[PDB]
Amino acid sequence: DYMPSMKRFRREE
Amino acid sequence: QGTVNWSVEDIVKGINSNNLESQLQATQAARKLLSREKQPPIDNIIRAGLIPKFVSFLGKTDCSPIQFESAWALTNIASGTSEQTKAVVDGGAIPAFISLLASPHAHISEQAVWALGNIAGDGSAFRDLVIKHGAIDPLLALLAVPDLSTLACGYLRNLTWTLSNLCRNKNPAPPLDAVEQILPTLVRLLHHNDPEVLADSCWAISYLTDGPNERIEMVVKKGVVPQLVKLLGATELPIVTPALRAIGNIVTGTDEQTQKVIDAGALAVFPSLLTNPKTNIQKEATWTMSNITAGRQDQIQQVVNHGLVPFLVGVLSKADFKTQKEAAWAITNYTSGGTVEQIVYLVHCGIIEPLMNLLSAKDTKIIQVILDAISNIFQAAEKLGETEKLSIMIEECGGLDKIEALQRHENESVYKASLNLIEKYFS
């Protein structure tokens, strides 16, 4: 919800 | 750059090419494929058997760029489903990334930190496996500087987030020794001036306090409760939210732990929290109050002294229904554990009418809770010989009609409790 994501995707810069 | 929009076939060709530079260009092309926002071909990359190659590239100390590109590719694969993360783990990625934590290149160690955060973030088993491989010491060693402000902000946020994932999830909760090893760094991060570092530190603390009173005690013993209360007062919602979660967790503990929350000055913030425009803040604040009113009579008295009972009346009167339910709980706990004088005070603040109004709700549990509260208040009234006055009070705001109607309610304990109330006080 408002918690940090469990996993994070590193997107195009 | 000539590494944009390669096919998977071309990537495989390059990675299999016996040329480190060709492998590097192909790995970068893979990274760029795997980092597009629209449906990155993670499963195609996995099916092509590339993961073991990426993992092997992690160990090429002589070619830091391919370490970086493969780290990023694997990071994004591990960000996916449990199955995709598992493909990364099964490729041997965990000790490779842990080895990369010691890299002299900040971007590479950072990418390793990120990857380990995704893997640990999958769940308890992978979290604990990351810990068994020995990630915690080098992770913490990355923060071994006199002043955290000299570290790059993004780097510090990534580290904090990964540590928070090492504190996250239950059944089982993290190993006790791992928690003890992480906690001091968490305390330090909890005093760092960056809103995201603060947010994530707070979330970590909230994870650690989400469990048995022994778990709570490990945290409370580190003396962080005053800092949590301070952060509870912050203007940034992403900070307040985990601060409040942690505080609520802590007051699910013992009377002494709860008392530590009160001594730190938490109650002074609840006029705002209980009227907060953000629904979940209000809900969690009211939940927190419900566990505080389940406390000792002197703690109930401190709730009274801080003027918080009118705010509970307020939330009961009008709020999101879930928040209202938390308020009903707060009241039932208050009346169960409170002195006669405290219950009298509660009635004088106007609790009866909104309590009665919520008896028309389509929720069996809150009906039960409210009926319980009414029972407790009637017990106080008996103790004062004022049951008739209370009966009249309930009747005048239309409570009697609702209770009479609850006699025909399908749930057993409901019509039993309501019939008892009718037969005992309304004849």
Residue numbers in the entry:
A (entry chain C): 881 to 893
B (entry chain E): 71 to 497
Describing publication, verbatim:
Among the NS proteins, NS5 is the largest (103 kDa, 900 amino acids) and the most conserved with a sequence identity of around 70% among the four serotypes. It contains methyltransferase (MTase) and putative guanylyltransferase activities at its N-terminal region, and the C-terminal region carries out RNA-dependent RNA polymerase (RdRp) activity. The importin-alpha recognition of basic-residue-rich nuclear localization signal (NLS) on NS5 facilitates its passage across the nuclear pore complex. In this study the structures of Impα bound to DENV2 and 3 C-terminal NLS regions of NS5 provided a structural basis for differential nuclear localization.
Due to the unexpected finding that residues 883–900 of DENV2 NS5 were sufficient for localization to the nucleus, we examined the sequence for the presence of a potential NLS and found that the basic residues at position 887–888 and 890–891 of DENV2 could possibly contribute to binding to nuclear import receptors for translocation to the nucleus. Alanine substitutions of K887/R888 and R890/R891 of DENV2 NS5 resulted in predominantly cytoplasmic localization (constructs 19 and 20, respectively). In contrast, the C-terminal region of DENV2 and 3 formed a stable complex with Impα throughout purification, and yielded well diffracting crystals. Crystals of Impα:DENV2 and 3 C-terminal region diffracted to 2.2 Å and 2.1 Å resolution, respectively. Main chain atoms of DENV2 NS5 P884, S885, M886 interact with side chain atoms of residues R238, W231, and N235 of Impα respectively. The side chain of NS5 residue K887 (P2 position) makes a salt bridge with the carboxylic group of Impα residue D192 and hydrogen bonds with T155 and a backbone interaction is also established with G150. The DENV2 NS5 residue R888 side-chain (P3 position) forms extensive interactions with Impα; its guanidinium group forms hydrogen bond interactions with N228 and also its backbone interacts with Impα side-chain residues N188 and W184. Strikingly the T883P mutation in DENV1 NS5 resulted in a mostly nuclear localized protein while the P884T in DENV2 and 3 resulted in a mostly cytoplasmic protein, establishing that a “trans” conformation for the Pro residue is required for the C-terminal NLS peptide to adopt a correct conformation conducive to binding Impα.
